[PDB]
Ligand binder design. Structure first.
Ligand SMILES: Nc1ncnc2c1ncn2[C@@H]1O[C@H](COP(=O)(O)OP(=O)(O)O)[C@@H](O)[C@H]1O
Ligand SMILES: Nc1ncnc2c1ncn2[C@@H]1O[C@H](COP(=O)(O)OP(=O)(O)O)[C@@H](O)[C@H]1O
Ligand SMILES: Nc1ncnc2c1ncn2[C@@H]1O[C@H](COP(=O)(O)OP(=O)(O)O)[C@@H](O)[C@H]1O
Ligand SMILES: Nc1ncnc2c1ncn2[C@@H]1O[C@H](COP(=O)(O)OP(=O)(O)O)[C@@H](O)[C@H]1O
Ligand SMILES: [Zn+2]
Ligand SMILES: [Zn+2]
Ligand SMILES: [Zn+2]
Ligand SMILES: [Zn+2]
Lengths: 815, 813
């Protein structure tokens, strides 16, 4: 072997400059540099992606070489690369629905614990591990079928307005557009009156239409009048098609049970009535599996509890000290010999999770309600007992949402993963992790076209000799922005009686016209206080658990919340259209000599309206390849190749650029081009100020990270902030930002507080907390151990506070 | 002699199938061979435990949520495996249907030469670039417009649609129309239309027949069933209301429309009887567009190049890679960029073709279909393909990569395995070849014997240490020199002649086979053995009896029947098993008609059949298994049983109908010691060696070597008395050296009954036990196809120009 190195040659994915790099296998390798520099294009876009393509084409020959539909990484050669697992899902994909207990494997193991070692009634038999699950017919309650809720449909729920005629869509529960008129045309063949108000039809007919199970198949004649339909039938003319009846109930319940669309399920649900299952009053299973207990609890009630509580309930059984042990060993059949080996097996797994500070989560907790750093940490933990050997793990900021007090627990789980025979590729901004890495790859001087090169590949200590590196400057040369003097409050906002999750009746104060950081351990309650409780207390006070508002209210006009979520879920969405600037752009195209010749208006230049867009992709530029059965991805449209418009629309040029020429423009280049178009140039200016000059006007939203989307939403709200009055609530606003980037972000947050506005930011890094004007330290620990206001004041005041876990770290930050 | 500790895969508590709770260590980064008797557990451990786990653990890690659920039928019984990396299997699962492919795609080579034809290659001087997809017959861009890339086209004709023209339309002149209402309807349409259905077809005007048969017109008319023609016309005149409105459809329309759109098996075939198949008029059997056909290289279109031996393809590409073709310098002088391109693209083709040629596979064409390949042939294609993949740090898992190999060619196989390993990969091989086993780094010997008597680990270490392990049957053959006694060859009862044989490798070849004796047909891989035996001999015999070119005729008077016994599965779904195949289930189902419980209810001998409605399960309809690559799962309703609750309330001597299906042959032999029509049949299956198989074990759980022996066992007693020729392709498929000694006995058995057995053979263990040998082709393909030697094994052991002679000679000690 030529070292234990992976060797990469000719990598030019996105902005990579046809680079060569080598990286050790069996080591913690960290990929670093500013955002937009090309760190992900390398670790994920190139390394992970080539490693996975190769494996799957070997396990599924030709039956997976569909790959070039989706795309290949742009790279000459990679040698020495094992198979790869990404511990994060792809950029623009929906997270699937799970529980914490499913992703950790734990829920299965405790079905076998209830099946073999649990406390049955006086004499009930034995219930199998398959029958402690709501998803199996051996486990699911027969009333609700494991749903926990019972669903009905009525005439009132399905026909909200009975003055309507059947042709007037009186039965609203039927599908929109064509599917609704089909059923209506089926009824005219059957000789029912479609042009008479609903309530005037016999009860017998109204019942049938709404409730029958019957599905007759009848000739249908579109566009005929009732009378001329009956003459068609009588004279035996060719039916256009044969239609199949479906009652209103049939359609509603089949649509509910079976569709994959999320908005359709929500429409259908508007014509339904919802009630709790009475055979399992909340729980979801047979009442015989529910009789089998443990520590006084059936599976359901144990599952509500935090992982930490389940752990300390389980271990007396593992260490052989239950309420007595000599009580049932002289009588035991197998039970005690199986209960011992399982309670220890479960608690060994649980220690891994608990040591990663994840013991505040409940095993019934839904995966989409979890932060990106929470689920990547629960996936890390699961790997640590998975027994996988000889793979590469590809991680994307596993310290996101982590308190500095907890990084040694993260660092220690990564070394254990390494020591199991694996290699770790980690894109990280945390200087504490970068410092502990075996090897590091520093990418690009800057972002985009001015980045994409390798500044350094070697152990961290040698970065001290490369001066073009901004990682090396923070790490070794002491880059500060010099201290920040706290600004004085203008008023005080009171949030009293905050009941929610781990907060009992907690009373807290937020100062106004000032910037506050809300800090604390993971699972403390910051997100529960700020994002959940605060936000939907003052959304209720305006025109868009418990809580109560108070304080100097007459100072607050608007609430603006800035989330981490994408700007859109599909490639329709982009900066151009989210900022609102595309509207004037289309105006400028509609005013050109050639557009004027043809009868084009600005509408021709929309990709959201039929006419001038490519209709093959409906103007999205990109097409879904449901060829990938593991989360589907996007390929460029085979007809427009990503331009989004037909050929005739692209013949029109405003100042030597077609409309796709402008959407392909970087924020920086469009800043040049639109200098003298006032409203466009100003939108682009806030996007530039906030660090996104490398992005393209039309770049689809599915290609964007959480921090790129957060900053777009912020910029949209940056110039609207004339004077004060708006409270901005922000979750970790420096997500995916380099220490050098946050300096540029913080200046813009200063600007909007100068305007008279109040920013409240849930915050995890002391760099940002050190330049606040006020600080709220939440809860001692996580979960039951947290939830208290534990310190409040200026950063300098709080850096000396007692019974604070962030204090020492804030203090190290302050200078 | 060097293994670093903790460089090992550590298995603990493995009990898959017949495995007896075993723990083994095997080293990674080595050739690891898994050896033992048949039915002993070699594949339960290698594929069922080690491959299956690596796979489960990766798939769960790549997609947690949605894919922790596929395992609805998949979970190996094993406590622990440390040290295990990702796995790649070079032979697909047991019961999966072979994917439709060609050699060209499997190897990736086809795509490289579409690319070559696109960028390099000679265009007619008025046409532009054809892209790589324009050269495939599987895309809209490349597939010929009329045949859609099939190369074949169907027509209909007056003669195919109306066989007997003397007939009238009313007495079914046009026989191509549907049978019952459908034909009656078209006739009634013609009476309404005023056409004469009561005159011989031949005496209708020329344009009436052409219209009835070919027109695309479809008038819609009033239909009056039952009326006479004269009554029909006055029903029309006075506008009498009809039964329904009928739409005319021509003989041609009916036939072509039904064939293309029908979803019935019996329809398609019926309608196909009236249609004629022919080479496609546009492409002439080459299945591509005329514009792709016009692009040439070395004088040939891509299709003509794709039908050449991989060896010839390498020898025309090779000059261009090496820059030594005639007049090269004047090519770079006059067309520099095509010279550059051609060279680059020829170079990576040549480089990959070299790997294939070094294994022994340069005799295949790139258009050769993969379902027509042997298993060893394609696993070796698959091996070769991995050698130019860039996979690092995986375990490859192989199942007899040496099946079909000549002992002259095993060293080429060993070089290939070594090259793979040194890529930073590990190798798990299940093997019976003693020469491969001799060279392994490590060796896992399984069980003493089969099923219940095996499943334990006899040895795990370097091959030589197997001398201190006396209970091991592989060690006996490999170190103790275990062998049979020498065989004296029987005299032929006659000689059948196969003359003028012309196909594939062979042109006008004359051959004789001795009757009443066992013959082995041997020679190197690709030399022509299966073509002679499995193809020409079998085709010529099945034609001579009721049931390429060659003519027979020696002592033909002495044979009456042909039966071929192949490696092909006994059936393709779980519906088929060993019980139902032999037919012993007829007596079992009838014994369940003898129970007094089956008298209280009217239980017809036919409630116990899973093949007919009634007493079977109604989610799987008696398969007992459900579809979920594709793998099988247990039924949601009958729970892997086949039967409903009512049927399984009847027991025969404390045994249900399902219980008896769960019976191993060896057990059923004890339990049915009195039911002659069952016992006798169970006793053939034991003689053959299949006592470890369950009576109703899905056909899809069987190996192929196992299916072959079930076929042979069905023959052993119908061989009873009579004159049948048996043709067998490698009767020793998944058999250990100790298993073949007892299969010989069964082959001798049907010769003693006055039969003739002809086997295409690769192991000199059985060739030594033959009465005659036919040695084919000096080498493979175009270097083969000749009869180089013939005689008793001793006679051929001494042949000069024969490559198998030295090995046969050695095997004769
Ligand atoms: N999934 C993706 N699809 C398309 N473009 C991408 C994707 N990820 C990154 N890019 C682009 O690659 C360039 C480099 O950015 P990136 O790879 O994200 O570096 P970093 O990880 O340091 O932010 C940017 O122009 C960015 O928009
Ligand atoms: N959607 C939810 N469902 C159930 N419990 C939740 C939810 N959100 C938060 N919690 C619980 O609240 C406590 C911490 O609140 P959170 O705001 O999530 O902490 P932080 O934001 O500091 O990480 C934890 O015990 C956590 O499990
Ligand atoms: N795919 C399979 N499905 C079900 N049973 C199997 C399968 N493969 C092997 N078995 C069973 O396991 C036992 C051992 O066979 P096997 O592991 O194939 O040994 P060997 O590989 O040495 O022939 C046999 O009873 C056989 O029927
Ligand atoms: N089904 C087939 N289609 C096309 N060519 C074939 C087919 N079967 C065999 N051949 C060719 O015939 C020659 C001899 O092959 P074969 O009879 O299969 O040899 P063997 O039985 O010794 O392996 C080879 O050139 C091979 O490529
Ligand atoms: Zn219920
Ligand atoms: Zn398009
Ligand atoms: Zn054709
Ligand atoms: Zn069933």
């Amino acid at each position: 072997p030529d070292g234990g190195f992976v060797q990469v040659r000719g990598a030019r994915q996105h902005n990579l400059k046809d680079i060569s790099v080598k990286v050790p296998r069996d080591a913690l390798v960290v990929f670093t540099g500013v955002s937009g520099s090309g760190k992900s294009s390398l670790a994920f876009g190139t390394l992970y992606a080539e490693a996975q393509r190769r494996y799957l084409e070997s396990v599924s020959p030709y039956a997976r070489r569909l790959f070039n539909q989706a795309g290949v990484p742009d790279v000459d050669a990679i040698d020495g690369l094992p198979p790869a697992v990404a511990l994060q899902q792809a950029r623009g994909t929906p997270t699937a629905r799970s529980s914490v207990g499913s992703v950790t494997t734990l829920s299965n193991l405790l079905r076998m614990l209830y099946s073999r070692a649990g406390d049955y009634p006086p004499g009930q038999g034995i219930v199998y591990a398959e029958g402690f699950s709501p998803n199996t017919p051996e486990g699911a309650c027969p009333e609700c079928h494991g749903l926990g809720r019972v669903y009905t449909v009525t005439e009132d729920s399905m026909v909200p307005d009975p003055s309507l005629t059947i042709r007037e869509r009186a039965v609203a529960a039927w599908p929109q557009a064509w599917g609704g008129q089909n059923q209506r045309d089926i009824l005219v063949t059957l000789g029912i009156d479609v042009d008479v108000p609903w309530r005037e039809l016999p009860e017998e007919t109204r019942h049938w239409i709404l409730f029958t199970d019957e599905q007759p198949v009848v000739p249908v004649y579109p566009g005929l009048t009732p009378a001329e339909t009956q003459r068609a039938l009588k004279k035996k003319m060719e039916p256009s098609y044969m239609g199949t009846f479906s009652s209103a109930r049939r359609h509603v319940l089949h649509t509910f049970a079976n569709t994959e669309s999320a908005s359709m399920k929500k429409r259908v649900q508007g014509y339904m009535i919802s009630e709790e299952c009475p055979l399992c009053h909340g729980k979801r299973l047979r009442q015989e599996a529910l009789n089998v207990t443990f520590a006084g609890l059936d599976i359901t009630e144990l599952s509500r509890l935090p992982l930490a509580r389940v752990s300390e309930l389980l271990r007396p059984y593992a260490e052989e000290r239950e309420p007595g042990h000599a009580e049932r060993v002289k009588n035991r059949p197998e039970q005690a010999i199986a209960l011992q080996r399982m309670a220890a097996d479960l608690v060994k797994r649980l220690d891994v999770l608990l040591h990663l500070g994840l013991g505040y989560l409940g095993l019934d907790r839904s995966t989409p309600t979890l932060s990106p750093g929470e689920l990547q940490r629960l996936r890390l933990a699961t790997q640590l007992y998975s027994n996988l050997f000889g793979v590469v793990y590809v991680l994307d900021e596993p310290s996101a949402g982590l308190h500095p007090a907890d990084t040694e627990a993260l660092l220690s789980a990564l070394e254990n993963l390494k020591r199991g025979g694996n290699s770790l590729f980690v894109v990280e901004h945390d200087l504490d992790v970068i410092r502990r890495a075996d090897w590091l790859v520093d990418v690009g001087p800057e972002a985009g076209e001015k980045g994409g090169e390798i500044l350094y590949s070697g152990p961290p200590e040698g970065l001290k000799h490369v001066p073009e590196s901004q990682t090396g400057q923070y790490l070794f040369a002491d880059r500060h922005t010099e201290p920040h003097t706290p600004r004085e409050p203008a008023g005080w906002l009171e949030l009293n009686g905050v009941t929610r999750n781990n907060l009992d009746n907690l009373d807290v104060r937020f100062p106004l016209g000032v910037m506050t950081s809300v800090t604390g351990v993971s699972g403390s309650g910051k997100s529960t206080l700020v994002s959940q409780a605060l936000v939907d207390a003052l959304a209720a006070h305006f025109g868009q658990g418990s809580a109560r508002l108070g304080g100097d209210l007459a100072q607050i006009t608007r609430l603006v919340r800035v989330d981490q979520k994408p700007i859109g879920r599909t490639p329709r969405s982009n900066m151009a259209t989210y900022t609102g600037l595309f509207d004037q752009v289309r105006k400028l195209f509609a005013a050109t000599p050639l557009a004027k010749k043809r009868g084009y208006n600005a509408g021709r230049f929309s990709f959201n309206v039929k006419g001038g867009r490519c209709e093959h992709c409906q103007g999205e530029g990109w097409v879904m390849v449901e060829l990938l059965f593991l989360p589907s991805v996007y390929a460029p449209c085979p007809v427009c190749h990503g331009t989004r418009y037909n050929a005739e629309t692209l013949e029109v040029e405003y100042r030597g650029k077609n409309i796709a020429d402008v959407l392909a423009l970087t924020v920086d280049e469009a800043h040049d081009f639109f200098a003298d178009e006032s409203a466009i140039f100003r939108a682009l200016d806030t996007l530039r100020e906030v660090g996104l000059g490398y992005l393209r006007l039309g770049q689809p939203a599915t290609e964007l990270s959480g921090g790129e989307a957060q900053r777009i939403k912020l910029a949209t709200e940056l110039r609207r902030s004339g004077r004060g009055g708006t409270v901005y609530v922000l979750d970790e606003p420096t997500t995916g930002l380099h220490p050098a980037d946050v300096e540029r972000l913080q200046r813009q947050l200063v600007k909007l507080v100068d305007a008279g506005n109040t920013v409240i930011a849930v915050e995890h890094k002391m760099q940002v907390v050190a330049a606040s004007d006020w600080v709220l330290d939440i809860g001692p620990g996580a979960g039951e151990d947290g939830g208290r206001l534990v310190a409040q004041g200026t950063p300098a005041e709080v850096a000396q506070a007692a019974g604070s876990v962030t204090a020492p770290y804030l203090r190290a930050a302050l200078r």
